[PDB]
């Protein structure tokens, strides 16, 4: 995808983790209160798959929007998932 494009990924966890760290939420000072990928963990699921990178925004998880989510809410939504997770993203700028 190019920056701004929507894309989706079915991501299988490794070690019960998606392999990303996230930042943001309506209660933070991060751009728009959005949920962004802050880092991709070495050897983790996101890295191995290769579609998600730092700066990508997470819009939804398993069909439910992360809009209006606090940081804690979004993190819980991301964690309260099974072994494979459907994620909807906006491509960031590298």
């Amino acid at each position: 995808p190019k920056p701004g494009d929507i894309f989706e990924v079915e991501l299988a966890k490794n070690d019960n983790s998606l392999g990303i760290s996230v930042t943001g939420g309506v209660n933070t000072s991060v751009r728009h209160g959005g949920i962004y990928v802050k880092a991709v963990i070495p050897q983790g699921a996101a890295e191995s798959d290769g579609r998600i990178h730092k700066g990508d925004r997470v819009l939804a998880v398993n069909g439910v929007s992360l809009e209006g989510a606090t940081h804690k809410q979004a993190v819980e939504t991301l964690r309260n998932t099974g072994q494979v997770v459907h994620l909807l993203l906006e491509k960031g700028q590298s």
Binding site: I20, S21, V22, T23, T28, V75, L78, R79
Partner: peptide, 6 residues
Amino acid sequence: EQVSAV
């Protein structure tokens, strides 16, 4: 400023 592992 909050960063969390998922």
